[PDB]
Design a protein around this ligand. Structure first.
Ligand code: NI
Lengths: 113, 113
């Protein structure tokens, strides 16, 4: 029932970025969440989240080792930010951390690792 | 035994800032929280937070309408941020938010009224 937007980012950004996104697509699969994923890599921004998505969303997930292009799009959102290598290692901190921020009566930003 | 650092900020002179610091100082001692408060006003920055203070603080409170100088300093802190006239109208909202951010497992940033 929830709708999640996300951005995965790697400096080089072709390999480490796509597997993060794919994992999240199947995580959102399981928990039956709606999801739109933006990719930022050395081949540039793909599936760029329109600001319609971002405002329609209940929580954002920022998986990155980088200075997100247009990181400011997300300041008015509940979100969880973590590194690439952290989401891949153990992601159910992350998906649980997402469900906490999702549940929390307050509008929290949560940084992991 | 908990330790809080705080920054109150207002463009419109040294009047809207000190009562904010005032109320917080006595919100704190009542809860027996240690507290150091940085003031940023038309007279400049007073009792600026030592970073050893910021790095050993359990949580920061950012009472500001404006853009804090050294907003940089709190990126790795648990903190609650709100505007001055919001902290003024009803302050218990704020410290219980503070006590959640203090309680909650992860480094959460909380933007409030
Ligand atoms: Ni933040």
């Amino acid at each position: 029932m929830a709708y999640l937007v996300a951005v995965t980012a790697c400096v080089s950004g072709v390999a480490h970025t796509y597997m993060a996104a794919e994992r999240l697509e199947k995580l959102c699969l399981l928990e039956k969440w709606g999801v739109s994923i933006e990719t930022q890599g050395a081949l540039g921004t793909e599936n760029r989240l329109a600001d319609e998505d971002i405002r329609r969303a209940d929580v954002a997930l920022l998986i990155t080792d980088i200075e997100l292009a247009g990181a400011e799009r997300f300041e008015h959102c509940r979100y969880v930010q973590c590194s690439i290598y952290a989401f891949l290692r153990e992601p159910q901190r992350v998906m649980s951390a997402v469900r906490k921020v999702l549940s929390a009566p307050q509008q929290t930003h949560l940084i992991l690792e």
